[PDB]
Amino acid sequence: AIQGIEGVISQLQATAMAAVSFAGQLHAALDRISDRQAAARVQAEKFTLGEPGIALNDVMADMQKASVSMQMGIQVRNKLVAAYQEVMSMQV
Amino acid sequence: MTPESVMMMGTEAMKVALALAAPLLLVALITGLIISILQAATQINEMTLSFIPKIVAVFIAIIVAGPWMLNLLLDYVRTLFSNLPYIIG
Amino acid sequence: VGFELLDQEKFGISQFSEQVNYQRALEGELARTIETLGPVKSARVHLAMPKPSLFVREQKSPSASVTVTLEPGRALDEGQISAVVHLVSSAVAGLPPGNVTLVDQSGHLLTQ
Amino acid sequence: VGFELLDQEKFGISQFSEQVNYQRALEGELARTIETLGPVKSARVHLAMPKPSLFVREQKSPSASVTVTLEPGRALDEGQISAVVHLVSSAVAGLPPGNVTLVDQSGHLLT
Amino acid sequence: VGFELLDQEKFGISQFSEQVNYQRALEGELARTIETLGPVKSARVHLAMPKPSLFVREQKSPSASVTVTLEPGRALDEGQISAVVHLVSSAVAGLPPGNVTLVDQSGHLLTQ
Amino acid sequence: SEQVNYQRALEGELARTIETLGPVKSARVHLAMPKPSLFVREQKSPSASVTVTLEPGRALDEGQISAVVHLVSSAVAGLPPGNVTLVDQSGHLLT
Amino acid sequence: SEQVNYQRALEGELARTIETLGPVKSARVHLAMPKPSLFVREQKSPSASVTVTLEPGRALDEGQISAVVHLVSSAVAGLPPGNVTLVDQSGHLLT
Amino acid sequence: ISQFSEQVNYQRALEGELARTIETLGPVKSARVHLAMPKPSLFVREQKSPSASVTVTLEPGRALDEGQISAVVHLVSSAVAGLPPGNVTLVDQSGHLLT
Amino acid sequence: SQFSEQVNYQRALEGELARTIETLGPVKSARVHLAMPKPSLFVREQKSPSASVTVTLEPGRALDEGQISAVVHLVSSAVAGLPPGNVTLVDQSGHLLT
Amino acid sequence: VTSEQWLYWLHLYFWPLLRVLALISTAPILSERAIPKRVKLGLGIMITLVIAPSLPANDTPLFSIAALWLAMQQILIGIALGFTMQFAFAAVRTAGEFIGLQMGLSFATFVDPGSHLNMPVLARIMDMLAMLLFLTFNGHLWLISLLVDTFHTLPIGSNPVNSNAFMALARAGGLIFLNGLMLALPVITLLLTLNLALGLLNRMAPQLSIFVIGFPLTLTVGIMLMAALMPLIAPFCEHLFSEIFNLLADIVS
Amino acid sequence: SWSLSVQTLVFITSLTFLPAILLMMTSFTRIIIVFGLLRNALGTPSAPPNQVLLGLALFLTFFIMSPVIDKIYVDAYQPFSEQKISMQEALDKGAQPLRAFMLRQTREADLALFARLANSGPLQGPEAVPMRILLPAYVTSELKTAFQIGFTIFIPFLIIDLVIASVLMALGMMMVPPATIALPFKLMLFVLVDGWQLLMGSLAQSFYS
């Protein structure tokens, strides 16, 4: 927006005068896990396609790693949900 | 929202309470005073005969002015509940 | 009657009474003005102001019946009949003209 | 027929009464000003202010009927009919001009 | 009377009574200033303060009707009409000028 | 009532000072102060109408109109000058 | 009421001291003390209007204009001088 | 005496005594002190500094020394909890700013 | 009220201090003004109290450097937590003695 | 990679949560049972989410007596703040109950003290009026701000503590009475005169007075008197809130 | 975009926080507090078996939040379901109408306080306020509004008890409990003045105003 760019220049002036989070970390972890899974899937599809240079060893190992990463994400989600349920049971 | 509005609504509320309670209290007071002066004139003194006509008078007071009180209080509550969403802050 | 009727009000007045009295007063003033129109010697207005509800299947709009007595031979003009209709309809919140009946002293329907 | 006219009625007045009295007072003052207009000898204003209903998808609007008695032969100008309309409409919260009827002493609709 | 009516030291039956008194006083003072002006012999101001809906965030605005009686032949200037408009609009919280009607003693609309 | 009374007192004193100004014989001030809101959006700016009666032929100077504007605007919390209308006894907008 | 009265008393004392200034015959001070708004971009601030009547020909010095400004600004909690308007009996803006 | 009344009265008394001492100063014939004590609010960080305006009437021709202006500044600033000298204005009977 | 009590206490201390300062040879009259710090509805912060002392001297009775010192000491001690450096001493002509 | 050190986040988010929730459970209006528990817990959680990252994180383990000392410290601070705030409403309730008792509204307490028959309806009226005024003056926001601010004065980390300071809060128990009389001094006084007047009537012909004429008259007089006295509480309300707030600021440090 | 397994995991996890959304981001909170206060007022701490009040509050919230839900569905859920907007952008698109409702009702003072507590820079317009500031400001504003509504609700039910006690005391019946007499009269009042229609309409207007 024009007013949005005004706000950007205002924050730049703020930085001049002066002279990431848990949700961000969870989003980063989800993005990393999804990117790994998509990379393994894309390599598997490329191997199934018949394109040269892609070895079955690498495909199978990358699928293994993607499965392990998915399981790690599932466990983290399970605990996190359990901790949230525990906190919401706290008496106030 | 302003404290003037808060104190105005409180004052109007308690004046409504005063209007609701004034007929009954005044009737009871008048009956008690009349019975007391009659006792003084007749030189009769028992603390229980002043309690008898007071109940009858106050109960008649609801017969005569009861509908007026019931209509006043309902109107007050209706107006208060209708003006509730305009004195929000 | 009418506005004067609502003067000596005893404290004991049920909302029902309040309303009925308002209806009477409106009827009176309307009849009064209708007499003011030249050709009219006396007027009588009856209002039927009822409950509203919501079911569109059964809605009964307000209704009015107006009886006029004319001066000897003073027939009312079509425009006159129209003006009586307008006045009565306006004086009653949500009165659809088509629910105003105007009748003369002989029982002729002047409206429709 | 007077703002102060109903400005008494002792007390014990159910608000219904307070409203009806306002309506009467507004009617009176409007008729008064209308009479002031030169050609007008006497005016009579009737207001129908609907009491709000939560039955219709939207709120309905009020209506007015104005009867004028003119001075012998003092016919009202079109612009005059227009000014009467404006005044009456403005004096009533949310009065759509088109709901103001103006009539003469002979029953001719001027609106 | 205007503020004088408020200074009669009379019990305000209720907030509604207080509001009616305030509306009347404002009307009185406005008419007063309008008369004070040279060409104006007497003024009459009627204010309509509006009312809110029930569940409709859609809003409206107040309206005013001003009747002036002029001195024999003292026609009001266009600028005059403009100044009357400004004064009345300003005196009423949120009064959109376009909702001020100015009329003369003959029924001529001096505004739009 | 307390508010309305405050408004009428402010109007009175302002008219008073305005009449003090040499060329001014009498002043009339009308204030329109709107409903306040403590939310995060609802807000409206107040308005003033000032009628002056001048001494026979005592025309107000431009600077004079400016000073009247300043005084009235300052006397009303958050009154934007541009919402002050000044008019003479003949209906001329000095604004 | 307690606040409004505080305002009236202050206005009075300020006018008093201003008159007690050699060239000043009478003073009139109007204060607009309101409530501010945060994160409303450009809000506003308390404001003052000062009308002075001078002794026949007693023009106020630029320093005199400055000292009046200082006094009025200081007497009002958080009054930014730039929101003090000083005007003479003829409607000339001195500030 | 309301809590507000109690404060306003305290302010008036402080003003009076300060003017008194200022007058006792040789060159000063009469003094007038106005204090503006500010308000804490749940929408600001550093509360605004109090301010003072001092008007002095001098004896015929008794001009105040630079040090006289300074000492007046010091006294008024000290008498007001957290009064930053720079917020003390000193003016004469002719409208000359001495500070 | 407590506030009234506090104001009275402040006034009495001022009076006695001025009294002792006058009793001193060169001093004809003294005036003491105390500014006790204040509390806030939020935020911690001490405001070391402050004092202003105006003395009127006897014709030509200039105060010694030691005298300024002793006045400083007395006023500082009489006020709980008064840092000497916050005591201002001034004469009848407006000369800062401190 | 994929560290997500959990102990650091837990120690950063725990102790501020403990202090905020301790204030929440005791602070007036924020501690009223009408609020669902989950709403209070969520408000504390969100306030801690906003505040904690700026504070220096503590490293004391949750499995140590130092953690117990920290938790006790946070609970003490929160309950002290909330209770010192509650003292003002206690004073208003006292004044209202005394006006009502001089009304003769509950005469059964003079004959049967604490006999399950008491209705301080005036006390409730002025208590809820005081709550409305406190809501209007945004006292709760201030409370939250001061809860945040007490960190700079008193950090999460275990710090040594003082003594007479506790007395101060306990000595604040005097204010409830003192200021209470300051709210009841006018009206009760006139009521006293009224009772004195009734005494003059009883000095005439014996009996035939009091319990038959005194009660309705004094009830109506108290009603209209304190109905007229209602506009007076608001300046006293602000005075009470200012007293509690600056006492808290002075003594918490 | 995320893998389908990650999308399913995120959807299932986000389904957990529905009570939190209902309590801290919705009208439900100030649609309940009023009900609890009114129940405290009439002297019947059980009367409408809770569950009844909870169901009424749920239906009221569903009727009140209808335009916000409609805007979310038309702007976020519809493009997401038609594979036009990714899963990580539907959330951001749909969080904006809820944020705007959360503003239309959140007072200022709270916004200023929570803008100061976060040590954030100046917020010249409402478009610079993040969710971390609006959430607790909205919560506090809703709590204060609910308590104001309930405390003006409480007044007539205490007025009736006051007048009942005074009338009982006029006649010397000092040992009659006033609450037992006042409860039927409070029920009669709440029956007469459309106790629930007026309260329902007042709450609904209180949201749309």
Side-chain angles (χ1 to χ4, degrees), chain F residues 57-90:
Chain F
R58 311 281 189 177
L60 279 192
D61 55 285
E62 175 181 59
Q64 200 141 13
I65 309 168
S66 309
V68 167
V69 169
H70 298 309
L71 179 79
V72 179
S73 67
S74 64
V76 177
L79 180 60
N83 288 1
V84 186
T85 53
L86 182 64
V87 186
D88 66 359
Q89 68 277 4
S90 36

Side-chain angles (χ1 to χ4, degrees), chain H residues 30-42:
Chain H
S30 59
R32 183 61 182 182
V33 183
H34 290 300
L35 298 180
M37 283 204 346
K39 300 96 178 183
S41 45
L42 206 72

Side-chain angles (χ1 to χ4, degrees), chain C:
Chain C
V1 283
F3 294 130
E4 180 254 60
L5 161 83
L6 283 83
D7 287 359
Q8 299 80 3
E9 302 176 359
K10 62 179 180 182
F11 293 119
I13 37 184
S14 170
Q15 188 179 1
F16 175 62
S17 310
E18 266 84 303
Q19 174 60 62
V20 171
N21 296 359
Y22 183 55
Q23 168 162 358
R24 294 162 94 293
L26 196 60
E27 282 163 355
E29 314 312 298
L30 293 196
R32 287 183 172 63
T33 303
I34 299 178
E35 303 191 1
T36 74
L37 299 196
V40 183
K41 179 174 180 170
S42 59
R44 184 61 182 181
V45 183
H46 290 300
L47 298 180
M49 293 184 287
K51 312 83 49 268
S53 83
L54 72 314
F55 300 118
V56 292
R57 293 186 49 242
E58 288 303 300
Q59 295 294 299
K60 290 78 184 303
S61 304
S63 54
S65 190
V66 184
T67 306
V68 292
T69 303
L70 306 180
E71 286 296 353
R74 311 281 189 177
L76 279 192
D77 298 59
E78 172 190 0
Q80 273 166 357
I81 300 171
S82 309
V84 166
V85 168
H86 298 309
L87 179 79
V88 180
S89 67
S90 64
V92 177
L95 180 59
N99 288 1
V100 186
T101 53
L102 182 64
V103 186
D104 69 357
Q105 68 277 4
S106 37
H108 304 98
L109 184 72
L110 301 184
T111 45
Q112 285 176 0

